[PDB]
């Protein structure tokens, strides 16, 4: 009935069929926000999954709407193996328990696994 509206802060190219493409400045209305870090959004003549990372809102552009860290950590387990790609990312194996310390909206959460701390995809994690 009254959809939130956001503004693309960079160009995005579709990698998959479900995705939508962006060009900087595009103004989208947001249909669904997934903790995955992918948001379903509509334009004129276009609708698809968009990385939330690539959006400012049209409200208070520089203020974050991310949660804030919980350095006590919260219990999660990996549902699917992921290999680190960047240096700040954490490789896990399916089934490993971790502690989530920051549920960033972008889909790349901060986690602690014993003596390694870093970024990991929220889509590949689950609660316990």
């Amino acid at each position: 009935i009254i959809l939130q509206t956001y503004r693309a802060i960079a160009d995005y190219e579709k990698t998959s069929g479900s995705e939508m493409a962006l060009s900087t400045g595009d103004v989208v209305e947001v249909v669904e926000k997934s903790e995955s870090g992918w948001w379903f959004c509509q334009m004129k003549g276009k609708r698809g999954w968009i990385p939330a990372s690539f959006l400012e809102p049209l409200d208070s552009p520089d203020e974050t709407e991310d949660p804030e860290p919980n350095y006590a950590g919260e219990p999660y387990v990996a549902i699917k193996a992921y290999t680190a790609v960047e240096g700040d990312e954490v490789s896990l194996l399916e089934g490993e328990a971790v502690e989530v310390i920051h549920k960033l909206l972008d889909g790349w959460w901060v986690i602690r696994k014993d003596d390694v701390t870093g970024y990991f995809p929220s889509m590949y994690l689950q609660k316990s």
Binding site: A10, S16, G37, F40, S53
Partner: peptide
């Protein structure tokens, strides 16, 4: 949604 995670943030 897509089965791969999205990309890391840019800019």
């Amino acid at each position: 949604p897509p089965s791969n995670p999205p990309p890391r943030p840019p800019a």
